[PDB]
Design an enzyme around this catalytic site. Structure first.
Site, short mmCIF file in Angstrom:
data_model
loop_
_atom_site.label_atom_id
_atom_site.label_comp_id
_atom_site.label_asym_id
_atom_site.label_seq_id
_atom_site.Cartn_x
_atom_site.Cartn_y
_atom_site.Cartn_z
N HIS A 70 34.09 37.42 48.30
CA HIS A 70 33.74 37.25 46.91
C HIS A 70 34.95 36.92 46.05
N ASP A 76 40.86 4.18 35.18
CA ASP A 76 40.74 5.17 36.25
C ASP A 76 42.08 5.87 36.47
N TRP A 114 41.84 40.34 49.50
CA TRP A 114 42.26 39.01 49.07
C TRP A 114 43.75 38.81 49.33
N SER A 142 44.78 20.00 48.55
CA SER A 142 43.94 19.37 47.54
C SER A 142 44.49 19.57 46.13
N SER A 143 44.95 20.78 45.82
CA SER A 143 45.47 21.07 44.49
C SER A 143 46.79 20.35 44.24
N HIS A 156 51.16 35.13 40.21
CA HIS A 156 51.13 35.10 38.75
C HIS A 156 51.13 33.71 38.10
N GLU A 194 49.30 31.45 39.42
CA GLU A 194 47.90 31.18 39.73
C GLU A 194 46.97 31.64 38.63
N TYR A 252 47.58 31.99 35.56
CA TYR A 252 47.61 31.18 34.34
C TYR A 252 47.00 29.81 34.56
N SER A 301 39.85 25.04 21.70
CA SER A 301 40.45 24.38 20.54
C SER A 301 39.56 23.25 20.05
N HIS A 317 55.62 43.03 38.70
CA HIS A 317 54.83 44.06 38.05
C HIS A 317 53.56 44.39 38.81
N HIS A 318 53.20 43.60 39.82
CA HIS A 318 52.17 44.00 40.77
C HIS A 318 52.69 45.00 41.80
N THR A 330 50.98 34.19 22.99
CA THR A 330 49.52 34.20 22.98
C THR A 330 48.97 34.57 21.61
N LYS A 378 48.57 31.51 19.40
CA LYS A 378 47.34 30.77 19.66
C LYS A 378 46.12 31.46 19.06
N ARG A 438 40.64 52.11 44.36
CA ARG A 438 40.05 50.82 44.65
C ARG A 438 39.66 50.70 46.12
C1 HEA Z 1 43.06 36.35 34.54
C2 HEA Z 1 44.31 36.00 34.30
C3 HEA Z 1 45.29 37.01 33.88
C4 HEA Z 1 45.76 37.21 32.60
C5 HEA Z 1 45.43 36.46 31.34
C6 HEA Z 1 46.65 38.25 32.63
C7 HEA Z 1 47.32 38.76 31.59
C8 HEA Z 1 48.30 39.68 31.68
N1 HEA Z 1 48.59 40.37 32.81
FE1 HEA Z 1 47.89 40.18 34.60
N2 HEA Z 1 46.60 40.46 36.00
C9 HEA Z 1 45.83 39.48 36.53
C10 HEA Z 1 45.82 38.21 36.02
C11 HEA Z 1 45.92 37.96 34.69
N3 HEA Z 1 46.75 38.77 33.93
C12 HEA Z 1 45.02 39.95 37.63
C13 HEA Z 1 44.00 39.18 38.43
C14 HEA Z 1 45.36 41.24 37.79
C15 HEA Z 1 44.82 42.19 38.82
C16 HEA Z 1 45.80 42.23 40.00
C17 HEA Z 1 45.10 42.17 41.34
O1 HEA Z 1 44.69 43.20 41.83
O2 HEA Z 1 45.41 41.17 42.17
C18 HEA Z 1 46.36 41.53 36.80
C19 HEA Z 1 46.96 42.73 36.63
C20 HEA Z 1 48.02 42.94 35.83
C21 HEA Z 1 48.77 44.08 35.77
C22 HEA Z 1 48.54 45.34 36.57
C23 HEA Z 1 49.24 45.25 37.93
C24 HEA Z 1 48.96 46.52 38.69
O3 HEA Z 1 47.73 46.74 39.17
O4 HEA Z 1 49.74 47.43 38.64
C25 HEA Z 1 49.75 43.89 34.83
C26 HEA Z 1 50.77 44.86 34.44
O5 HEA Z 1 51.91 44.52 34.21
C27 HEA Z 1 49.59 42.59 34.33
C28 HEA Z 1 50.29 41.94 33.39
C29 HEA Z 1 49.67 41.13 32.47
C30 HEA Z 1 49.98 40.99 31.07
C31 HEA Z 1 51.04 41.70 30.27
C32 HEA Z 1 49.13 40.09 30.56
C33 HEA Z 1 49.12 39.60 29.14
O6 HEA Z 1 49.28 38.18 29.16
C34 HEA Z 1 47.91 39.90 28.26
C35 HEA Z 1 48.24 39.22 26.93
C36 HEA Z 1 47.18 39.46 25.89
C37 HEA Z 1 47.49 39.88 24.70
C38 HEA Z 1 48.67 40.80 24.49
C39 HEA Z 1 46.61 39.53 23.53
C40 HEA Z 1 47.48 38.94 22.42
C41 HEA Z 1 47.02 39.46 21.08
C42 HEA Z 1 47.88 39.64 20.10
C43 HEA Z 1 47.38 39.68 18.68
C44 HEA Z 1 49.32 39.96 20.39
C45 HEA Z 1 49.69 41.28 19.70
C46 HEA Z 1 51.04 41.76 20.19
C47 HEA Z 1 51.16 42.92 20.78
C48 HEA Z 1 50.07 43.45 21.67
C49 HEA Z 1 52.50 43.61 20.78
N4 HEA Z 1 48.48 41.98 34.92
C1 HEA Z 2 36.91 34.94 39.85
C2 HEA Z 2 36.83 35.97 39.02
C3 HEA Z 2 35.82 37.03 39.22
C4 HEA Z 2 34.47 36.95 38.95
C5 HEA Z 2 33.76 35.76 38.38
C6 HEA Z 2 33.89 38.16 39.27
C7 HEA Z 2 32.59 38.53 39.19
C8 HEA Z 2 32.12 39.80 39.28
N1 HEA Z 2 32.88 40.82 39.77
FE1 HEA Z 2 34.72 40.87 40.32
N2 HEA Z 2 36.18 40.55 41.53
C9 HEA Z 2 37.19 39.69 41.25
C10 HEA Z 2 37.18 38.89 40.12
C11 HEA Z 2 36.05 38.31 39.69
N3 HEA Z 2 34.86 39.02 39.77
C12 HEA Z 2 38.19 39.69 42.31
C13 HEA Z 2 39.42 38.84 42.40
C14 HEA Z 2 37.79 40.63 43.19
C15 HEA Z 2 38.46 41.03 44.48
C16 HEA Z 2 39.31 42.29 44.30
C17 HEA Z 2 39.80 42.73 45.66
O1 HEA Z 2 39.59 42.04 46.63
O2 HEA Z 2 40.68 43.74 45.75
C18 HEA Z 2 36.55 41.17 42.68
C19 HEA Z 2 35.82 42.14 43.27
C20 HEA Z 2 34.83 42.81 42.64
C21 HEA Z 2 34.21 43.95 43.06
C22 HEA Z 2 34.53 44.71 44.32
C23 HEA Z 2 35.65 45.71 43.99
C24 HEA Z 2 36.33 46.17 45.25
O3 HEA Z 2 35.78 46.05 46.31
O4 HEA Z 2 37.41 46.97 45.15
C25 HEA Z 2 33.25 44.30 42.13
C26 HEA Z 2 32.37 45.46 42.21
O5 HEA Z 2 32.02 46.03 41.21
C27 HEA Z 2 33.31 43.32 41.12
C28 HEA Z 2 32.57 43.17 40.01
C29 HEA Z 2 32.11 41.93 39.64
C30 HEA Z 2 30.78 41.59 39.15
C31 HEA Z 2 29.64 42.54 38.94
C32 HEA Z 2 30.78 40.26 38.93
C33 HEA Z 2 29.62 39.46 38.38
O6 HEA Z 2 30.04 38.83 37.17
C34 HEA Z 2 29.06 38.39 39.32
C35 HEA Z 2 28.05 37.53 38.54
C36 HEA Z 2 28.62 36.17 38.21
C37 HEA Z 2 28.40 35.58 37.05
C38 HEA Z 2 27.92 36.37 35.86
C39 HEA Z 2 28.98 34.21 36.80
C40 HEA Z 2 28.20 33.14 37.58
C41 HEA Z 2 28.93 31.83 37.50
C42 HEA Z 2 28.29 30.68 37.46
C43 HEA Z 2 26.99 30.51 38.19
C44 HEA Z 2 28.66 29.69 36.38
C45 HEA Z 2 29.03 28.34 36.99
C46 HEA Z 2 29.89 27.58 36.01
C47 HEA Z 2 29.55 26.40 35.55
C48 HEA Z 2 28.11 25.97 35.52
C49 HEA Z 2 30.57 25.55 34.85
N4 HEA Z 2 34.26 42.36 41.44
CU LIG Z 3 50.54 39.74 37.19
#
Ligand code: HEA
Ligand code: HEA
Ligand SMILES: [Cu+2]
Ligand SMILES: CCCCCCCCCCCCCCCCCCCC(=O)O[C@H](COC(=O)CCCCCCCCCCCCCC)COP(=O)(O)OCCN
Ligand SMILES: CCCCCCCCCCCCCCCCCCCC(=O)O[C@H](COC(=O)CCCCCCCCCCCCCC)COP(=O)(O)OCCN
Ligand SMILES: CCCCCCCCCCCCCCCCCCCC(=O)O[C@H](COC(=O)CCCCCCCCCCCCCC)COP(=O)(O)OCCN
Ligand code: CUA
Lengths: 57, 269, 236, 48, 353, 100, 63, 535
Positions: H64, H94, H129, H159-160, H243, H245, H247, H258, H292-293, H318, H321, H440
């Site tokens: 999943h 094209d 994963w 592909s990417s 990380h 990825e 973004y 926008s 930080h992971h 951010t 924006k 987890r």
């Molecule tokens: C989906 C894409 C995505 C995005 C957008 C981000 C956004 C950020 N992530 Fe990442 N992150 C992931 C992907 C992403 N992350 C994923 C998938 C995980 C799970 C890891 C996994 O298990 O593999 C993870 C988990 C994760 C962790 C936990 C790691 C762990 O489990 O220990 C951390 C901690 O450092 C982190 C960092 C951040 C930070 C600081 C941001 C920031 O960019 C968030 C920024 C948002 C804002 C801050 C809003 C801005 C609003 C304002 C008005 C600013 C105001 C100013 C202040 C707040 C001072 N991320």
């Molecule tokens: C890609 C981002 C993503 C998405 C979409 C989701 C979708 C959901 N995820 Fe998350 N989830 C992850 C990120 C994401 N998850 C990741 C990375 C893991 C793995 C973590 C691990 O391996 O450690 C995970 C695993 C995970 C687990 C298992 C946790 C574990 O085993 O430790 C669970 C269980 O509660 C959960 C919750 C859900 C639920 C209820 C949804 C529901 O939202 C599902 C329903 C889906 C929809 C609501 C959207 C349908 C989309 C389309 C049909 C739209 C198509 C688009 C176009 C037409 C343009 N997710």
């Molecule tokens: Cu990160």
């Protein structure tokens, strides 16, 4: 007179930033003086009673 | 745009490719290669003549692409000044990507060279592994590469002065000066004391100097297709992009080898 | 301690490190609540006032003062957040004289505890293995998937150093109340320190994935007094 | 032949079998494959 | 612990070259461009004596504060005299910070093999300032790192004045030694050519892509040859570095296009990196072999030899370019750089004392 | 950077040179898109501009936009007691007198 | 006005269906022996003798 | 034969985007049913649907993760919206390398087959994963499952890379007559800044995966600690890809928002140059932080302090924006159509899911939240409610132009509200379960974690009903879609102004800032014969 109006939006902006911050500070000063400090007080008054029982024994 | 009969010719300098079948066949060959290599390594097939068919079909698929790339440029005549710039930008962005694979392999060397574990008694090249002396055949390969980098400059400066015998000879000398590198480096892999499985040291030494081997078979092929396409009169004195890409690919490999010789062969302590 | 059924917040603390963690989290939540309320009020004003409006101000598109105010004001918040985070990172650790060492080796699907001191002249080191009690063999009142057969018994008001490693795959030692979460990777030793202020039972679970029996591997710590620890150590 | 039903890989109107069957079977296969995978790997490991 | 000092020195050198080089996006021009380098050249020997008196950490943060207030006075300055004063205080802050930071990396890392690696990492900040948008993320990243440094140095443990336990050799005794001077001359004559090449390049011949390959090659060269210089001998690295600087300098007059400068510029920057990371640790080695171990004045001499090129460069380079021209200037500096390279062999084994 | 007395001259010059209905509605659309309300002199030029191109609904819709641009009700009635000889000579009727 | 009613009464009949589906997966559950009131009252005595959750609360009773 | 030379042997860039959409729909259906399988097992304590098998729970979680990080969000955001819209926005006929576009499509159906065949030949691939080394060896997973799953991460990488080089090469020299690279639209900048990270991140992943393969099957011992290696090295070589990825998944969303904010609120975007500089800063500061992971692996005390400092800095670009989107929506007129509903539901939920990232950035606070459901609740508010919402908004924005057939408004609104309610019910009690201490990747849990797991199993059944209603919306779009343009005025791209009469508006209907909405709507196969002109 009443037929000379120059600025209206800027006053709205300055009011809408100076109310969204007062409301934000009001909703954040209940988290730190009604949720946080009494828990630390309760934690401390539990620890100024466990030591006195051991002092008695 | 106000030239007289302008409607009869294309109004923008870009190439509209005709319909070709090769993307599907490359993917169908990589399907077979991936599944056969995943299966033969754990049983399930036994006979090792399906993997070789998969590799042969992949390489023939790239060769069959490059035929239609050549015919669209020397016969149809659709390569303007803009399309050549696009091809050069494209090739530079693959050379850059093929450099960054070596960065991860170099960082896999410095993460163990500086700070070795306790299981290996803390020492590079560890006890019982005799390394390769860098005052032997790894000097000959370096001087052959520096000579091959010098001979192709006599080949690119003889196609601009319109001397034909002087472009063929230099490319021939370069093609025999890369075959000797492979022949020397296959003799340095049969007279060694340590294998891919004998340490973390024998496992990273045959994985950074083995990718270079595959990358230098490609120069032998790319220089054969640059000698053969010059013998049959396809290269003009101002429109040659097969030579320019083979020159940029050779020099990057020389610079990479000069970093695979100070870090891998000389520095051990 | 034990988890509670409809929980909202943290478990209760028995270590100064966990109290510092709670205080730092409650310090950050202030500024995050302020920012969320500001953004929500601006969207409320936008929805209430400027929905289906006749007049469009289509020339207010530059800004010069206001782009500095949303660039410098978040920075000050980051400095104020970053001061106690660095103080908590550096200050609260084993600065002076740990008083015990317990090696907690993680095998495949159980735990192995060695109390490395109290050595005789022949190597009579006290050692045990902790397993999980199955559901069929539970007695009346024991907690399912958390209760063990042998528990780590430690004194109160004593610095304890845990050295964690593993023999098979990557594990993770966790007792949530005590503030201990360190990995167990198979070729290196890691260390944490804990000080316990009150008696009780402290429960924990493994974190990093290890295979099929990941959900049955608990950790249980009892904090007896010193007399009970001496009487317990002369029996094992 | 450029028009509103010309850029799609499938035919929609003037068709023998109505479009509801190819539209439904696509989603039926898409939400039926990962139950078949679980059925196979459950039956290979003893449990029902 | 020990790595936060490396972070502080890296950021100090980054802010040094950022406030030196980057003045235009963020004769009178000859005097105004060289206002910083000469005042740094003058006030460098004083800080080497000051760090023996009051200690290492206080001049670093004093220089950071002086640099901040001088930049903020330079921000809204219109008159010429106040602008000259502002850039003078900018230079005198940047003279304290680099000297005291390099001395404290010399003091903490006592082992000879680790010192070369750490200074090879630390000298890489001299090209990130040349390479370096909005830049407000990076300034607050720097502010956070220096907050961590201030917390560890001044808050958790108390700090007094605390003068050093041993008394160092004076500056004239160091200047009477031949080895320290001849080590400093390598850095000076290596940086002189790249100092003079910058103003005469708009005369001969967009702007960022000519300077980008040197900034790419410098980091790779210093971070690789900081580590590998211990086994190969530092004198051999210095000799090969001066040779490659000379050859790449003579390669420029044969080039007749903007895109033909990319390949020699790499051969500049990597080479001068292998000049730096080889030769700046070994000065701190020599005092451990022949003198008493106080590292302030020696790295003051090293910073003098570094900044002499940027002080003398553009003012003489414009006069030579008006007099004779670009290719003969490049020819004479290349022959000087090649001719200096034989005599760096003398640092193979100095006599101990 | 633009002041009231330059706005109320530039839009008069723009309103005194329109030739079609598209142009009158174009200049009228971006006149009500600033922070400055239009002067009573500019609106008096806009009604003559709507008279030259012979449109009736645009001459009514100008007075309806003033009710939304102006902050209060007293200022709106202060606009209507000075734009009165313009209305009763050309003949323009407001929306609240037509009840459409 | 006759469209917002349609959206509201379309969302309600989207929430009612999921509740009836989730209820069917709620009657047919495997309930282990620990989830009974006479078992979660024996756990409270053990958590009371060894003092646990002093500040907030301990209660394992959720029927 | 004409079917083959036009939908299998293709050159046109807009005809591969529709195939990408059809593939992405299937690969987003499969993972959603796999998520419903997981959430129906984590409902009440015990062993409910999977009888006793803790394998075929980790396999479902792994498959999943992979099917929606690699097979849904990237093909939709790169193939359907990047291949189709970027030539029309920059004004090209094209792409520059069309055969590479065809191979970048056709490498993915052989990548689906190997992943689906990594769950039938054996126990399976339950490595998570992140395929960590000492679990995914030959002592726990001994079979052709992990090997066939790490060959599905090579083809997607190729592909990417081939798509990213095409995107960078096209926008440099295939623009129209009067466009410099400062008048480009924001979506082109989003595609460029994600295509640079695709170059700079994927070699490290390919190297780490290949060295894991050599450790598994050629007994090399890079990451085995009985020969002189460390597993932690792999973690470095994974997260340097990881990380960038995350973004890559979110930058193409931003630009889409926008356009909607620029359209249905009739104002230009506040500070476009600040926005492109903010995207550049976010793209650059996603490469200097990766550790930080990994705060619990045993790093130094002076290295955690660097990675807490370099992580909180990303909040500063951010916020520019977000506040610029608020300043764009402030002054203008707002009409609530079905793209702007998803636009409004993205500016609030990305903020809520992103403010949790500041709490997790501290190394002192990560000791309480690592490998806990707080992380899951953090990244589902940003992945499911930030990227999928942008995808739905982009579909409902650009589908009448591409297809030529309109859709029912009411059913789309019902779908949006069902998604909103169900997804906000599903991922919010995960924060409470994380704060109380639930780890987890566990099938069975102690009885205290029951009640919230009863509520998060209820919202998933709401969201699947919304997916089925989306399927019916597509069916009602394709059949009788010509007659769905007079039901509501949502079909109009822009509304009449205050002074603009209806008779004038019907003559001059479309007012735009890009080339997109002035084309005939089926877009022509060859859409530019004579070049476009910009002053
Ligand atoms: C989906 C894409 C995505 C995005 C957008 C981000 C956004 C950020 N992530 Fe990442 N992150 C992931 C992907 C992403 N992350 C994923 C998938 C995980 C799970 C890891 C996994 O298990 O593999 C993870 C988990 C994760 C962790 C936990 C790691 C762990 O489990 O220990 C951390 C901690 O450092 C982190 C960092 C951040 C930070 C600081 C941001 C920031 O960019 C968030 C920024 C948002 C804002 C801050 C809003 C801005 C609003 C304002 C008005 C600013 C105001 C100013 C202040 C707040 C001072 N991320
Ligand atoms: C890609 C981002 C993503 C998405 C979409 C989701 C979708 C959901 N995820 Fe998350 N989830 C992850 C990120 C994401 N998850 C990741 C990375 C893991 C793995 C973590 C691990 O391996 O450690 C995970 C695993 C995970 C687990 C298992 C946790 C574990 O085993 O430790 C669970 C269980 O509660 C959960 C919750 C859900 C639920 C209820 C949804 C529901 O939202 C599902 C329903 C889906 C929809 C609501 C959207 C349908 C989309 C389309 C049909 C739209 C198509 C688009 C176009 C037409 C343009 N997710
Ligand atoms: Cu990160
Ligand atoms: C998978 C292996 C890598 C696949 C990529 C192959 C290398 C990239 C080829 C770059 C070619 C660029 C190009 O378009 O050049 C044309 C020549 O093609 C060519 O003929 C270049 C020859 C490429 C042969 C590649 C052989 C590698 C296969 C070995 C695998 C082992 C131009 O033609 P032109 O314009 O210069 O002609 C002049 C007319 N007068
Ligand atoms: C944190 C802040 C987050 C803000 C979130 C967004 C809120 C809505 C902003 C709407 C945009 C406002 C806007 O652009 O207009 C500006 C008004 O300035 C202002 O309203 C702000 C002025 C700031 C005043 C500061 C105090 C000064 C008084 C000090 C006394 C001592 C300048 O309008 P413009 O000039 O760009 O119009 C140009 C002519 N087309
Ligand atoms: C390793 C995978 C990446 C290698 C691809 C490098 C391709 C560089 C050469 C290049 O960019 O030219 C394109 C492909 O040529 C080629 O060189 C075809 C190489 C295709 C290799 C496919 C990957 C197999 C593994 C032109 O392709 P075009 O036909 O669109 O040019 C249409 C106008 N003449
Ligand atoms: Cu054992 Cu986790």
């Amino acid at each position: 007179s009443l037929t000379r109006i120059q600025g209206s939006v800027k006053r709205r902006i300055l009011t809408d930033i100076s109310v969204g911050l007062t409301l934000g500070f009001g909703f954040a000063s209940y988290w730190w003086w009604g949720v946080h400090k009494p828990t630390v007080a309760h934690r401390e008054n539990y620890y100024i009673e466990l030591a006195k029982k051991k002092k008695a024994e | 745009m106000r030239i007289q009969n302008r409607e009869n010719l294309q109004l923008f300098p870009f190439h509209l490719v005709t319909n070709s079948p090769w993307p599907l066949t490359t993917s169908l060959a990589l399907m077979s290669l991936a599944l056969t290599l995943g299966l033969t390594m754990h049983g399930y097939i036994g006979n090792h003549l399906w993997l070789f068919l998969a590799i042969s079909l992949v390489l023939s698929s790239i060769f069959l692409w490059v035929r239609d790339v050549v015919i669209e440029g020397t016969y149809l005549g659709d390569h303007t000044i803009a399309v050549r710039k696009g091809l050069n930008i494209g090739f530079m962005l693959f050379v850059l990507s093929e450099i960054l694979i070596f960065a991860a392999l170099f960082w896999s060397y410095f993460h163990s060279a500086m700070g070795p574990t306790i299981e290996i008694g803390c020492q590079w090249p560890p006890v019982g592994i005799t390394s390769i002396k860098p005052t032997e055949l790894p000097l000959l390969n370096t001087i052959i590469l520096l000579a091959s980098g010098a001979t192709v400059t006599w080949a690119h400066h003889s196609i601009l002065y319109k001397d034909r015998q002087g472009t063929l000879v230099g490319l021939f000398i370069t093609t025999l000066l890369i075959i000797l590198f492979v022949g020397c480096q296959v003799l340095e892999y049969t007279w060694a004391t340590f294998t891919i499985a004998d340490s973390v040291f024998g496992s990273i030494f045959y994985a950074g100097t083995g990718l270079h081997f595959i990358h230098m078979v490609m120069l032998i092929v790319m220089l054969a297709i640059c000698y053969a396409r010059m013998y049959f009169y396809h290269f003009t004195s101002n429109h040659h992009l097969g030579l320019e890409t083979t020159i940029l690919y050779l020099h990057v490999l020389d610079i990479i080898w000069l970093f695979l010789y100070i870090v891998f062969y000389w520095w051990g302590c | 301690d034990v988890p509670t059924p409809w929980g909202i917040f943290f478990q209760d603390s028995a270590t100064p490190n966990m109290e510092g963690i709670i205080e730092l989290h409650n310090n950050i939540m202030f500024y995050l609540v302020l920012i969320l309320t500001f953004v929500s009020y601006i969207l409320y004003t936008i929805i209430y006032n400027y929905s289906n409006a006749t007049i469009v101000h289509k020339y207010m598109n530059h800004g010069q003062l206001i782009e500095i105010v949303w660039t410098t004001l978040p920075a000050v918040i980051l400095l104020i957040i970053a001061f106690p985070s660095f103080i908590l990172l550096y200050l609260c650790d084993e600065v002076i004289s740990p008083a015990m060492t317990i090696k907690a080796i993680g095998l495949q699907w159980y735990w192995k505890y060695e109390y490395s001191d109290f050595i005789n002249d022949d190597g009579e080191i006290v050692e045990f293995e902790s397993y999980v009690i199955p559901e069929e063999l539970l007695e009346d009142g024991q907690l399912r998937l958390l209760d063990v057969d042998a528990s780590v018994v430690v004194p109160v008001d004593t610095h304890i150093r845990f050295i964690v490693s593993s023999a098979d795959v990557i594990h993770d030692f966790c007792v949530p109340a005590l503030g201990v979460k360190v990995d167990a990777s198979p070729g290196r030793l890691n260390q944490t320190s804990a000080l316990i202020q009150r008696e009780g039972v402290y429960y924990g679970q493994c974190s990093e994935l290890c295979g099929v029996m990941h959900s049955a591997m608990p950790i249980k710590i009892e904090a007896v007094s010193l007399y009970e620890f001496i009487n317990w150590l002369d029996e094992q | 032949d450029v028009g509103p039903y010309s850029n799609l890989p499938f035919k929609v109107k003037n068709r023998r079998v109505p479009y509801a069957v190819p539209h439904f079977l696509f989603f039926a296969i898409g939400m039926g494959i990962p139950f078949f995978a679980c059925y196979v790997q459950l039956k290979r490991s003893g449990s029902i | 612990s020990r790595k936060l000092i490396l972070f502080i020195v890296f950021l100090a050198l980054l802010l040094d070259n950022m406030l030196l080089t980057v003045v235009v996006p963020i004769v009178q021009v000859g005097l105004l461009f060289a206002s910083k380098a000469t005042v740094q050249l003058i006030t460098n020997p004083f800080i080497g004596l000051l760090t023996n008196r009051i200690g290492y950490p206080i001049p670093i943060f004093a220089g950071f504060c002086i640099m901040f207030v001088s930049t903020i006075m330079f921000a809204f300055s219109s008159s010429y005299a106040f602008l000259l004063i502002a850039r003078s205080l900018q230079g005198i802050g940047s003279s304290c910070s680099s000297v005291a930071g390099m001395g404290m990396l010399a003091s903490v890392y006592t082992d000879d093999e680790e010192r070369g690696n750490v200074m090879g990492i630390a000298l890489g900040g001299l090209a990130m300032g040349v390479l370096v948008g909005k830049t407000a993320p990076f300034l607050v990243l720097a502010a956070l790192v220096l907050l961590d440094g201030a917390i560890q140095l001044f808050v958790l443990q108390p700090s007094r004045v605390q003068p050093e336990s041993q008394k160092g050799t004076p500056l004239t005794t160091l200047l009477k030694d031949p080895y320290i001077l001849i080590a400093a001359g390598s850095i000076c004559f290596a940086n002189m050519g790249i100092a003079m090449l910058e103003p005469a390049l708009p005369i001969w011949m967009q702007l960022g892509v000519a300077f980008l390959p040197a900034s790419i090659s410098y980091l790779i060269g210093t971070n690789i040859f900081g580590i590998l210089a211990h086994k190969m001998g530092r004198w051999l690295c210095a000799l090969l570095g001066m040779i490659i600087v000379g050859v790449s300098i003579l390669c420029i007059p044969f080039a007749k296009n903007i895109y033909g400068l990319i390949a020699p510029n790499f051969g500049v920057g990597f080479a001068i990196g292998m000049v730096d990371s080889s030769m700046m640790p070994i000065m701190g080695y020599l005092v451990d072999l022949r003198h008493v171990s106080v590292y302030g004045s020696v790295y003051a001499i090293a910073d003098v030899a570094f900044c002499m090129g940027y002080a003398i460069g553009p003012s003489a380079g414009g006069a030579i370019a008006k007099a004779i021209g670009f290719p003969w200037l490049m020819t004479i500096i290349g022959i000087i750089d090649i001719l200096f390279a034989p005599l760096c062999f003398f640092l193979r084994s100095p006599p101990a004392k | 950077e633009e002041t009231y007395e330059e706005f109320s001259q530039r839009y008069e010059k723009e309103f005194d040179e329109a030739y079609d209905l598209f142009e009158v509605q174009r200049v009228l659309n971006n006149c009500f898109s600033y922070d400055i309300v239009p002067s009573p002199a500019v609106i008096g030029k806009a009604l003559n501009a709507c008279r030259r191109v012979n449109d009736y609904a645009t001459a009514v819709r100008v007075f309806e936009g003033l009710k939304h641009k102006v902050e209060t009700k007293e200022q709106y009635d202060a606009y209507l007691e000075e734009l009165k000889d313009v209305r009763e000579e050309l003949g323009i009727d407001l929306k609240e007198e037509l009840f459409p | 006005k006759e469209d917002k009613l349609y959206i509201f009464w379309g969302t309600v009949i989207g929430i009612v269906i999921s509740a009836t589906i989730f209820g069917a997966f709620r009657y047919n559950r495997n309930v282990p022996k620990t989830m009974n009131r006479e078992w979660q009252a024996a756990s409270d005595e053990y958590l009371k003798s060894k003092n646990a959750e002093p500040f907030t609360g301990y209660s394992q009773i959720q029927s | 034969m004409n079917y083959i030379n036009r939908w299998l042997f293709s050159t046109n860039a807009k005809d591969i985007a529709v195939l990408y959409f059809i593939f992405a729909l299937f690969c987003g259906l499969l993972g959603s049913i796999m998520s419903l399988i997981l959430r129906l097992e984590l409902s009440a304590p015990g062993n409910q649907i999977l009888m006793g098998n803790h394998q075929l729970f980790n396999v479902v979680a792994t498959a999943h993760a992979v099917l929606m990080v690699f097979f849904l969000v990237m093909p939709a955001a790169i193939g359907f919206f990047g291949n189709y819209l970027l030539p029309l926005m920059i004004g090209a006929s094209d792409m520059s390398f069309a055969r590479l576009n065809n191979i970048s499509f056709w490498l993915l159906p052989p990548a689906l087959v190997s992943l689906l065949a990594s769950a039938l030949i054996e126990n399976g691939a339950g490595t998570g994963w992140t395929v960590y080394p000492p679990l995914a060896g030959v002592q726990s997973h001994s079979g052709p499952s992990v090997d066939l799953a790490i060959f599905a991460l090579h083809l997607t990488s190729i592909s990417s890379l081939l798509g990213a080089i095409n995107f960078i090469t096209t926008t440099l020299n295939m623009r129209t007559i009067g466009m410099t690279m400062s008048k480009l639209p924001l979506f082109v900048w989003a595609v460029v800044f994600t295509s640079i990270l695709l170059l700079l991140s994927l070699p490290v992943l390919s190297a780490g995966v290949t060295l894991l393969l050599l450790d598994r099957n050629f007994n090399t011992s890079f990451f085995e600690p009985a020969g002189g290696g460390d597993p932690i090295l792999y973690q470095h070589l994974f997260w340097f890809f990881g990380h960038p990825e995350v973004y890559i998944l979110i930058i193409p969303g931003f630009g889409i928002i926008s356009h909607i904010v620029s359209t249905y609120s009739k104002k230009p975007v506040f500070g476009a140059i600040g926005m492109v500089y903010a995207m550049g800063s976010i793209g650059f500061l996603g490469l200097l932080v990766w550790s930080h992971h990994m705060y619990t692996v045993g790093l130094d005390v002076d290295s955690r302090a660097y990675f807490t400092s370099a992580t909180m800095v990303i909040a500063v670009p951010t916020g520019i924006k977000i506040f610029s989107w608020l300043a764009t929506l402030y002054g203008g007129s707002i009409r609530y159509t079905t793209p702007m509903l998803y636009a409004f539901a993205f500016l609030f939920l990305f903020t809520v899911g992103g403010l949790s990232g500041v709490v997790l950035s501290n190394a002192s606070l990560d000791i309480a939240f690592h490998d806990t459901y707080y992380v899951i609740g953090h990244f589902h508010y940003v992945l499911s409610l930030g990227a999928v919402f942008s995808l739905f908004a982009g579909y409902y924005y650009w589908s009448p132009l591409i297809t030529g057939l309109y859709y029912n408004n009411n059913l789309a609104n019902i779908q949006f509200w069902l998604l909103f309610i169900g997804t906000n019910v599903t991922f919010f009690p995960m924060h409470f379960l994380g704060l109380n201490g639930m780890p987890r990747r566990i099938p069975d849990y102690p009885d205290a974690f029951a009640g919230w797991n009863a509520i998060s199993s209820f919202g998933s059944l709401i969201s699947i009903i919304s997916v089925i209603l989306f399927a019916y919306v597509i069916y009602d779009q394709l059949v009788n879609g010509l007659t769905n343009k007079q039901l509501s005025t949502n079909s109009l791209f822009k509304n009449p102004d205050f002074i603009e009469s209806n008779i004038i508006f019907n003559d001059n209907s479309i007012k735009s800032s890009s080339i997109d909405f002035l084309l005939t709507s089926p877009p022509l196969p060859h859409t530019f014969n004579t070049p476009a002109i910009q002053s």
